[PDB]
Design a protein around this ligand. Structure first.
Ligand SMILES: N[C@@H](Cc1c[nH]c2ccccc12)C(=O)O
Ligand SMILES: N[C@@H](Cc1c[nH]c2ccccc12)C(=O)O
Lengths: 326, 326
């Protein structure tokens, strides 16, 4: 089948927005395509991290990905650092990428007006990300609007390498998410929902307990009209809430409007709070079952193992072309 | 015992000056100290390389080191790329080093007034070099006046890592060769002898054949005072020769001076030429023996093994501290 590579920054918290926009759809994709889900812990180290928190967030993320419904026998789930080829191929590519290319990256602006105290990791992480991708001959890389820049560079490195040393890598394509909706902040309906929002009331986490989901939805910003009708502009807040309600319950927007006809936001919010709790419940159940189970490790184990099989043969061929070793 | 780490760039052409200044001393030292001789092929790739050449020079140099007298049961001799812990540890170190430190690196001058098209690996090989040294707890690194700068950085990185994560690394020390024998070039006695000299007659290669040694020596530059007397200033050429002669035949400089009291440069050169030929003879043989012998790879294999055995361990500990993997 076609291959798909997806790197996951270990951070132990993914929003209902991530779930709805991309994650959820993967459970389907994993039968049509050959998926790889790498918990890129080496990339997470480019910025300060607490060792214990990071070690923890790596298990959390794997627990949660399985909990959501990723099948470890169908797809491949693994931790980046337990597959050495990543770092090995990262070095080889660093050697074919020019400094300029990495400097002119619309993300290295992190150098902040004379910071200087920036890890070289920040500057060099793109060639590692190219490795993550290229090592498995991936075809599609499900990234957002923002990442596109990195995809292009890996595409460039792939070809540069191919022409200099021979046809080895597959040029990857940056495919966008399905969504067709987008989940906005509950506190500012114009802004997009994210884990990195300074206000916790802005998002709902797949591990938020009922009491907290109840609390956050009540607070979600609506408007003064008092009617449950879809209106992108004019009624941003309601329209968002309706969007969340609809994708999770399977009921149309037209349907939900008709249902909440002469009802106000008070009950609407109380209803939504429920549909969310009813939807996260099994996930939070399964998740804890995975955090307790030693079967988790056995999964990561065969994950790496399956990944290593391919990565290695790729590096072998890379070292072969470059002229390294024997 | 104490550990000594030495990275060797693959070039297959080491001069009689390198030999006299460092190599020779190791055939002895390898019995007291724990020595690692790493053929840094990953570093050699930061600049344009031809696959065949690099692949070749790696053998040639392994052969050479054994020929000169490195006892593989006593010391460890391995190729860099064959021990993954090097790249792995290189990445983690790139993450605790700031971009400034790498730019203010007095060697990055190869940036050519803004040539811009330089391999990022060029800007980043210092962290790899720190890896190489640090992975083996090495106490001493025999580098010349030229590399000092890099040893300073690795001393720094090592110190930084230890403070953040705890005592793990030995802060190495750069210990130079035994002073007195600084072998200048055969054509310019104020210039140092190097494989990188554009005039072939400025140096003698451990594999230079008799006819070539004879011709280069004869053309060695001398003064007109026509006496075989040591004179650092005034008589540079003769003092160089007297140094090459002395260090090889074991005679004292004065001994040679007296022994030549009423002789000219014609005979002195004819004598020197043969004592050089006599010294390389067994090396050139042992070198060809090793080259075609399949035992070479076996030696390299047990080198990887021994190296990896320690490297893997140190990486495991580094990953532990940084918070990577499981
Ligand atoms: N920084 C990217 C990095 C990344 C690493 N490996 C990947 C694989 C696929 C897509 C992105 C990546 C992100 O968080 O998305
Ligand atoms: N550039 C140094 C690099 C080096 C790599 N690995 C090393 C290990 C020890 C000392 C120096 C190094 C040289 O050619 O000498």
């Amino acid at each position: 089948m076609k291959t798909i590579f997806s790197g996951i920054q270990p951070s132990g918290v993914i929003t209902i927005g991530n779930y709805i926009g991309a994650l959820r759809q993967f459970v389907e994709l994993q039968h049509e395509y050959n998926c790889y889900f790498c918990i890129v812990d080496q990339h997470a180290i480019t910025v300060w991290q607490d060792p214990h928190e990071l070690r923890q967030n790596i298990r959390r993320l794997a627990a949660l990905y399985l909990a959501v419904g990723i099948d470890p026998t169908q797809a491949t789930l693994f931790i980046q650092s337990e597959v050495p080829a990543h770092a090995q191929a990262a070095w080889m590519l660093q050697c074919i990428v020019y400094i300029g290319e990495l400097e002119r990256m619309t993300q290295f602006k992190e150098k902040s007006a004379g910071k200087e105290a920036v890890s070289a990791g920040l500057l060099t992480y793109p060639p590692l990300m190219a490795a993550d991708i290229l090592l498995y001959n991936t075809d599609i890389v499900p990234v957002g609007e923002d990442q596109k820049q990195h995809i292009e560079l890996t595409r460039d490195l792939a070809e540069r390498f191919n022409k200099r040393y021979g046809e080895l890598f597959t040029i990857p394509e940056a495919r966008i998410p399905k969504v067709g909706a987008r989940i906005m902040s509950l506190v500012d309906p114009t802004k997009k929902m994210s884990k990195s929002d300074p206000n916790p009331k802005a998002y709902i986490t797949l591990l938020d307990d009922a009491k907290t989901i109840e609390k956050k939805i009540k607070s979600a910003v609506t408007d003064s009209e008092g009617t449950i009708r879809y209106d992108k502009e004019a009624k941003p807040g309601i329209s968002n809430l309706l969007n969340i309600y609809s994708t999770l319950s399977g009921q149309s927007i037209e349907e939900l409007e008709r249902q909440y006809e002469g009802k106000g936001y008070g009950v609407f919010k109380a209803d939504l709070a429920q549909v969310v709790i009813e939807t996260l419940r099994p996930i939070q159940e399964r998740y804890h079952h995975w955090m307790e189970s030693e079967e988790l490790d056995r999964v990561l184990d065969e994950g790496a193992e399956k990944a290593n099989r391919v990565a290695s043969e790729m590096v072998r061929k890379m070292e072969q072309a470059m002229g390294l070793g024997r």
